[PDB]
Amino acid sequence: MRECISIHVGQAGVQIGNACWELYCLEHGIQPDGQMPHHHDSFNTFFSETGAGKHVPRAVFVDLEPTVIDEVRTGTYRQLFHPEQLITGKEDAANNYARGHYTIGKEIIDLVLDRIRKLADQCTGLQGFLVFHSFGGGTGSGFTSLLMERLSVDYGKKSKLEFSIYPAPQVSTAVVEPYNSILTTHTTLEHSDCAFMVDNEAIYDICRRNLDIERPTYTNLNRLISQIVSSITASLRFDGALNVDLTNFQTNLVPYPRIHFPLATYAPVISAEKAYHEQLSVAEITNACFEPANQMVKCDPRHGKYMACCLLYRGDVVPKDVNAAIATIKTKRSIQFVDWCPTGFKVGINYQPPTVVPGGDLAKVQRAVCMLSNTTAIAEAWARLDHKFDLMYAKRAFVHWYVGEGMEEGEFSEAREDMAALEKDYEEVGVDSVE
Amino acid sequence: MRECISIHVGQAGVQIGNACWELYCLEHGIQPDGQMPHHHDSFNTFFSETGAGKHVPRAVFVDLEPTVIDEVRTGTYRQLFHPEQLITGKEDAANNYARGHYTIGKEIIDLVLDRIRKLADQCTGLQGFLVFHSFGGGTGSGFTSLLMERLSVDYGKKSKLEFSIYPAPQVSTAVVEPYNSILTTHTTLEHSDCAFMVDNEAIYDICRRNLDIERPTYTNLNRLISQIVSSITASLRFDGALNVDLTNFQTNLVPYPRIHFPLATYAPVISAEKAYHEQLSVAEITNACFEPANQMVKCDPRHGKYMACCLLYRGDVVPKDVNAAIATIKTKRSIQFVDWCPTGFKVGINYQPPTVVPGGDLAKVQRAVCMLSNTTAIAEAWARLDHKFDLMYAKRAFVHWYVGEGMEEGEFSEAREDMAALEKDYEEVGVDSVE
Amino acid sequence: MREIVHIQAGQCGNQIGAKFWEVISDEHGIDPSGNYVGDSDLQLERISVYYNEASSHKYVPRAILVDLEPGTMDSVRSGAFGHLFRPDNFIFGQSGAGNNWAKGHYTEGAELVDSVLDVVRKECENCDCLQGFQLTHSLGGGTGSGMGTLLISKVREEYPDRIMNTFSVVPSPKVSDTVVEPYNATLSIHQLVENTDETYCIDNEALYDICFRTLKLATPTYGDLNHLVSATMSGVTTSLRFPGQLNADLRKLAVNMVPFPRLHFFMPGFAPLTARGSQQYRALTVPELTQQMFDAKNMMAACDPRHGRYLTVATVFRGRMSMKEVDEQMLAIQSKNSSYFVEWIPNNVKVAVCDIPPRGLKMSSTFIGNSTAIQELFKRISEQFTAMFRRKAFLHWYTGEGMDEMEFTEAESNMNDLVSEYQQYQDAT
Amino acid sequence: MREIVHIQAGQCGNQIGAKFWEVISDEHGIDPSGNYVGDSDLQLERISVYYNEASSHKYVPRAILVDLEPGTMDSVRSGAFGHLFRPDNFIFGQSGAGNNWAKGHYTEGAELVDSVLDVVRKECENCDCLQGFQLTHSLGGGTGSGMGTLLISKVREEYPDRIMNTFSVVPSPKVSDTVVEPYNATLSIHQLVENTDETYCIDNEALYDICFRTLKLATPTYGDLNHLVSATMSGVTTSLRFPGQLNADLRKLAVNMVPFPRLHFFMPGFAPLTARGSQQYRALTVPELTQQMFDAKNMMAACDPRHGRYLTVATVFRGRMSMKEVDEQMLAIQSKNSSYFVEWIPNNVKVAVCDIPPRGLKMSSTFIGNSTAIQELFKRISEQFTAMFRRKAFLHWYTGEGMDEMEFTEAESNMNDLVSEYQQYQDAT
Numbered sequence A, B: 001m002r003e004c005i006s007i008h009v010g011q012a013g014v015q016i017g018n019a020c021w022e023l024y025c026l027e028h029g030i031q032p033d034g035q036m037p038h039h040h041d042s043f044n045t046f047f048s049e050t051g052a053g054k055h056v057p058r059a060v061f062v063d064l065e066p067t068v069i070d071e072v073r074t075g076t077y078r079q080l081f082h083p084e085q086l087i088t089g090k091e092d093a094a095n096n097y098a099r100g101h102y103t104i105g106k107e108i109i110d111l112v113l114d115r116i117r118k119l120a121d122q123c124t125g126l127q128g129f130l131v132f133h134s135f136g137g138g139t140g141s142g143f144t145s146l147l148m149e150r151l152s153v154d155y156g157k158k159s160k161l162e163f164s165i166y167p168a169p170q171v172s173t174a175v176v177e178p179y180n181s182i183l184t185t186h187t188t189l190e191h192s193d194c195a196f197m198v199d200n201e202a203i204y205d206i207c208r209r210n211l212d213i214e215r216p217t218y219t220n221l222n223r224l225i226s227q228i229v230s231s232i233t234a235s236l237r238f239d240g241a242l243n244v245d246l247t248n249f250q251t252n253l254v255p256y257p258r259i260h261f262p263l264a265t266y267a268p269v270i271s272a273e274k275a276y277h278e279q280l281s282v283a284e285i286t287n288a289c290f291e292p293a294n295q296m297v298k299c300d301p302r303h304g305k306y307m308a309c310c311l312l313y314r315g316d317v318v319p320k321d322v323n324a325a326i327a328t329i330k331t332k333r334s335i336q337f338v339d340w341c342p343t344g345f346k347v348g349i350n351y352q353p354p355t356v357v358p359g360g361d362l363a364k365v366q367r368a369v370c371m372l373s374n375t376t377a378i379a380e381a382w383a384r385l386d387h388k389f390d391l392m393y394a395k396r397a398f399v400h401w402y403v404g405e406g407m408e409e410g411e412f413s414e415a416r417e418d419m420a421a422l423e424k425d426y427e428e429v430g431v432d433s434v435e
Numbered sequence C, D: 001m002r003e004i005v006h007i008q009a010g011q012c013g014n015q016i017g018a019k020f021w022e023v024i025s026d027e028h029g030i031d032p033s034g035n036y037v038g039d040s041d042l043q044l045e046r047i048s049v050y051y052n053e054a055s056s057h058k059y060v061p062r063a064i065l066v067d068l069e070p071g072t073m074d075s076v077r078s079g080a081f082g083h084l085f086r087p088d089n090f091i092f093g094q095s096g097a098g099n100n101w102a103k104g105h106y107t108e109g110a111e112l113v114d115s116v117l118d119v120v121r122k123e124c125e126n127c128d129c130l131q132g133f134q135l136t137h138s139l140g141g142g143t144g145s146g147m148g149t150l151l152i153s154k155v156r157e158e159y160p161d162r163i164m165n166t167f168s169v170v171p172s173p174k175v176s177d178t179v180v181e182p183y184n185a186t187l188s189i190h191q192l193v194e195n196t197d198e199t200y201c202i203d204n205e206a207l208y209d210i211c212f213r214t215l216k217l218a219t220p221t222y223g224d225l226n227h228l229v230s231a232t233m234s235g236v237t238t239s240l241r242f243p244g245q246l247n248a249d250l251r252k253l254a255v256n257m258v259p260f261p262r263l264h265f266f267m268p269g270f271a272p273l274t275a276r277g278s279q280q281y282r283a284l285t286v287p288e289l290t291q292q293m294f295d296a297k298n299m300m301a302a303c304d305p306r307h308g309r310y311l312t313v314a315t316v317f318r319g320r321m322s323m324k325e326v327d328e329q330m331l332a333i334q335s336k337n338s339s340y341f342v343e344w345i346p347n348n349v350k351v352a353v354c355d356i357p358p359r360g361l362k363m364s365s366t367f368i369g370n371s372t373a374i375q376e377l378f379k380r381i382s383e384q385f386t387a388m389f390r391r392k393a394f395l396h397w398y399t400g401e402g403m404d405e406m407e408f409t410e411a412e413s414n415m416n417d418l419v420s421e422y423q424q425y426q427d428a429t
């Protein structure tokens, strides 16, 4: 009845979406082929119903290179997806935002926009867009920019939520990573309501310590991020003692036109053998979620101040003990809020306990907490990325590639100055000021 | 009771008619041999019953060369057709309009007319004529123009509908199409109630893109044509909640005596494996039929105005959503009507779902939409074709074949200015005028 | 139905026909004896066009083989495939024309032409509805070039409302088989232009390159050399002999390809060509056919179309094959090679499709394109002829049998006039 | 999808290619006859990139083999694994260039280059979507260096928006196979720099160290020596041939590893390299692969990085193996060897992971590194060249085939200019 559509861009987007839609299929009790053996609406939010008993997702898979889309076609989820949406080009952007935004990006953007319009007109009470894309990827960044511009032009005032993949400080897999990051962030700073950040090194630390897995393939990381996505969406997808919506998320998290860069966290993340020797109480999971060693962005909030917080509890939950835990964490010393935000908390509750996938790394739980914090600890990450980009650009490396692929110098200069101003404003707002 | 006869001329008409009459027996449950395994009339308007249980069609197959008719006699549909009607000459016209209209047309025109009066007297409530003739060829252009003179005088005011094969702009089978087309249109402009336009290059895109077939032989292409043909007369042969007769479209789609050139369109056209993942609702097939990528003539309607429209639904259709879906089309701005046509739609419903021939490309479907819009977008088709012919006549290429076979040079000038007059009037009426 | 008459003149016509009717025999599945031994009835539905049904299920060709010397008939009659021809058709003279125009047109051709016209008329009445005449001759020899145009005039006056096709063999530019080549050519063509509907200008040494390059045959003999000519011969007339999705006929080719009465000189072309060894490594697919068809080197006439433009282009496909790709391909050929087409004739393509593949091949195609590059073919012959005629060389042997000096005047005054009109159209606006 | 064309020039190209296509055949399960005999269907999902589907499940490769003498083609044609090539591709001349630049670029290369340009254009249109060109040649001989440079220029102008890779074999520093090495090298490099995108500088005698020491082989023949070159040749382009968790492609490497248009000379490397007897005692794990890769001992070019710095580095792992330890170990290498990286290029490492392990091995890695250590490789060549040209030796017949003395002036004035920026960037701040 309130319809939200998901756009998955790049190889990271496609894999994360595969994991996320798998998790949705287990959550709503639907078989991979579309049949099925509080519950029934819920699936009408995502799974559009066809003439027969089959249900089909509202997903729009788009890529330039065809290999990953061929893989997802050949995967076990071959019947579920509607074959038309799997849009593939012929060659990738090869970590070139110029290629992914100007040269080839305009030859397929018309088709993806046509499919978006078809799906959005198909639904009734459209809510918004969820964009699953990376930052290092050239196609990811270019299509992110292009699709943000096109969707903002077409649909005026709707929710546009992004689940990015922040570049890691020490872990690195690209060389034009600072260029891609600066360009995409400058382009999509003004065209997104609220953009979450996820980093791979942080997830690797979490999986190494909290879950104690020595062989953490990308499947486990994708499973984790899918769990956060499902937790944030379960409020719309299910009924609870206190519901919360995407507009609620925006209006309670982001206070300013530019400062809309929160970070996600999930709890509890404990292993299988350690499940038996733990109690899993509301207060203890709340403390674990607020623990700085569980955050999924490699930035310790001890260097900064929390500015806004939203927590969704799901499962059997009592609002009294939720209140007690929130009050004691508010009165704790190490967590420090801003002076001009006397109330910095937003609580939501859901009656549906999370369900664990078969063969997954996590264990079955009766209570789950998802946390989304808008803080100032992201300023250090912005500063580090800006410093890396400036150091790389000081002697004009790869600029010949970028300029040859239809660029100029004003774009780089304006992106640099724009992120300098954004970091300055972020720090000035986050820091305490007299009066 | 109300009877219409079909005249199929040339290998275009015969090949279309081979699959055209393939569909009617399937619709009325007629075995190829005439035996049988809404109902009970159905077939009395097409299948003139004989003494035995056999039903024979009301078709007049005529051609100059004895080639294309030969496989009809030796095909699987051998017993169904009555052996007398298959009129054949001895040699073709060789894409020569002069040969098929002055030299060899006359020596056989008196034989087809004999079988017309034979069949017109056999029926009681004769309604009109169906013509299946192309434009590029000789026997399909010059010979059928002779018929339009012969049937008009014999029967003053009856229905005369033509299902032409418009020559394609880029695709070009023959080399003298600009000579055959302009000579045909000028003579048959004043002897046609309405002429549905079909282009050959347009059906490739429909089969390649919408249906996703890489090997579109003429067997599969002609299948997509008989569906509209069986759609125009789908209300005479079956009872519906809102019936339409052949004079309805003739009255609803002809604002002026000259502007009577509509263009067909069919929907839904979807593949077999894609059928399971489509909802196939009344609300979308109205939009699916109207999209500019689904028309069967290579002329995008966005360049012009919709002079009028006409829709014929069927199956489990409810007249409310038809009212609802049609109403919202006026709001959407890909449609653009003329000022003097505030009401510009016609709707017809039927209770018989369409039936798919076994082995065909289409899949079983419960609904069908067949739009016939007279629109200004066809004005570019005449002007573009008129440019090609005007280039030929500049240096009188290929003329010596025409002049020596029984036509004058002066006759060519009259056909040239006639298309200029039609183009001027059609654009002037289509464009707005003061007061 | 629409029967065809085959006329063979000269040694080449007999030699080409000796292998041509081998190709027709295999296609329609007849034994060398003359009795049908085929399997599919699709062949016999239209068998009267070329063969003639006789008593006791025997078929005889509707062809006449005539030459001024008896050496050629002695080979075909004594050898195999001589037991199916009706012995009446074997017309022979007493001595060859000796590469002399006058001896093949006035002296030794006058008495023979009356005998052959009887068999032509006798065969025509046996026909149901005549469609045209196929004539195979040589433009370099005496009997084939001399009498061949004499028979054309005799046939033309008595069947005026009828079509005919001539598969003339243009003399080779690089090599001259006979010393007096130009005199025979310029006299025959001047008589050919007036009363011929359409001609196929093929060459000899231009076909030497084709066999040497693709077929990689080191020793191309006339037995294998004529085989490629027969395939082009059989590919033109297989449209009315077999069913097709989009049929063509001999009258369709002429109207589509003759913008003006004087411009009816053609360039044939056949594809695919592949040796036995290297045919496993090539995927027989419709895209490769058109590209192999249009390249300048794979042409059956010794004239590269690079220096000229295509007036009109035909294409007669064969075998089971889809219609879309051939339709869209020739647009790509038209788009890519857009600078080599006449501006004032857009969409200058005729396409036709058959439904029966050639023997031992999945599909094939035949190209017949009226090009302007013929202009360079006639200029050489005119240049060579005008050089020798100035010295009056060999002239005293021609004028002694009927001809005279000013006879050459009109022939040369027609060639330079025809080549002028043939030239002032490609540059015309 | 995203096809690339393989070009082989010189004697090395066919010798490398004769073993290169041996490796690709085993990966895709292709029998020598050319028929698929494999079992897994994953290899056939992307088979068109290298091979081409043909009639009756034939898989002829997209290979062009060209040489100036017939002494190399007869070996591959008559020998095994020659039954799958198409004989049209076997382009050959009559006489070798004789280790002459002019006799491989000016005199005889004019007529041979027109034949190959036909086949590559014919192959390009047969392709679905061309991705780039992959070339194998030698920088020491005449035919490989001479025409191969000429072919690049002609390919570059026709296809400007396409990438190409040259797997050139840099002349050995310590040992000189040919007396005139420097003259061929500087003429080719001066023309290669401005008309190429990415080159892999491998070495001859540097390969001798690895097989003798690391693989402990006493008699390294060219059959075994070329096998190692194939492994680093099949690993760079295996990313698009097979699925992976973090895929790469030919364009992806060129974007990351080419900071400037001139600085595009690379340094390959392969790992692991263990003998048959000593492979039981080594635990094939992710850790040692990176350590066995970054050391100066296991490097395929005769260059010591201890005298230079790594500008950019790309490592392409293979096999089923996790990615967490890939970066944690790459960070350790980045931290422990922090003195050996360029300061103004942070995080200068690119990584990619495939899914299919190499034959008979659980996992392997391929290292390509753009380093400054090449600076001394060109200086040694430049030092040798400037000494011989001063004496005006061996050029008394270079001028005899069109080329002139002033040609040396620009070739040498750029090599010292190229090395100037190739070195001034290392100490640049």
Ligand SMILES: Nc1nc2c(ncn2[C@@H]2O[C@H](COP(=O)(O)OP(=O)(O)OP(=O)(O)O)[C@@H](O)[C@H]2O)c(=O)[nH]1
Pocket (backbone or CB within 6 Å): A009, A010, A011, A012, A015, A016, A064, A065, A092, A093, A094, A095, A096, A134, A136, A137, A138, A139, A140, A165, A173, A174, A200, A218, A221, A222, D245, D246, D247, D252
């Ligand atoms: N969280 C997560 N991130 C991934 C995963 N796979 C790849 N990535 C990230 O994606 C980045 C690669 O960029 P992509 O968007 O995949 O680029 P691509 O799909 O190859 O297409 P191009 O950008 O044109 O080359 C890497 O830097 C990774 O950090 C994954 O499975 N999980």
Ligand SMILES: Nc1nc2c(ncn2[C@@H]2O[C@H](COP(=O)(O)OP(=O)(O)OP(=O)(O)O)[C@@H](O)[C@H]2O)c(=O)[nH]1
Pocket (backbone or CB within 6 Å): B009, B010, B011, B012, B015, B016, B064, B092, B093, B094, B095, B096, B134, B135, B136, B137, B138, B139, B140, B141, B165, B173, B174, B200, B218, B221, B222, C245, C246, C247, C252
């Ligand atoms: N839609 C469709 N069109 C066809 C088909 N077959 C032929 N045509 C069209 O018919 C045209 C040829 O002209 P025709 O009128 O058929 O020629 P003909 O019927 O053989 O008569 P002649 O001109 O005397 O030879 C071509 O340009 C085609 O576009 C078919 O199977 N389906």
Ligand SMILES: Nc1nc2c(ncn2[C@@H]2O[C@H](COP(=O)(O)OP(=O)(O)OP(=O)(O)O)[C@@H](O)[C@H]2O)c(=O)[nH]1
Pocket (backbone or CB within 6 Å): C010, C011, C012, C015, C067, C096, C097, C098, C099, C100, C138, C140, C141, C142, C143, C144, C145, C169, C177, C178, C204, C222, C225, C226
């Ligand atoms: N294509 C082809 N042409 C041939 C063949 N044999 C001969 N010719 C041509 O025929 C010409 C011979 O002239 P003809 O017309 O046959 O003369 P003839 O039959 O010997 O009689 P005379 O003119 O009196 O000598 C030669 O110039 C050849 O070009 C052949 O086997 N194949």
Ligand SMILES: Nc1nc2c(ncn2[C@@H]2O[C@H](COP(=O)(O)OP(=O)(O)OP(=O)(O)O)[C@@H](O)[C@H]2O)c(=O)[nH]1
Pocket (backbone or CB within 6 Å): D010, D011, D012, D015, D068, D096, D097, D098, D099, D100, D138, D139, D140, D141, D142, D143, D144, D145, D169, D177, D178, D204, D222, D225, D226, D229
């Ligand atoms: N890697 C490798 N290199 C080889 C092999 N055989 C020869 N080479 C190199 O190739 C060079 C031979 O020069 P080519 O370019 O092949 O010259 P060519 O083919 O003999 O023709 P000419 O230049 O006219 O003599 C030698 O300098 C070797 O360094 C081999 O088996 N493997």
Ligand SMILES: [Mg+2]
Pocket (backbone or CB within 6 Å): A011, A065, A092, A093, A094, A139
């Ligand atoms: Mg990619």
Ligand SMILES: [Mg+2]
Pocket (backbone or CB within 6 Å): B011, B065, B092, B093, B094, B137, B138, B139
């Ligand atoms: Mg016809």
Ligand SMILES: [Mg+2]
Pocket (backbone or CB within 6 Å): C011, C069, C096, C097, C098, C143
């Ligand atoms: Mg003779």
Ligand SMILES: [Mg+2]
Pocket (backbone or CB within 6 Å): D011, D068, D069, D096, D097, D143
């Ligand atoms: Mg050599």
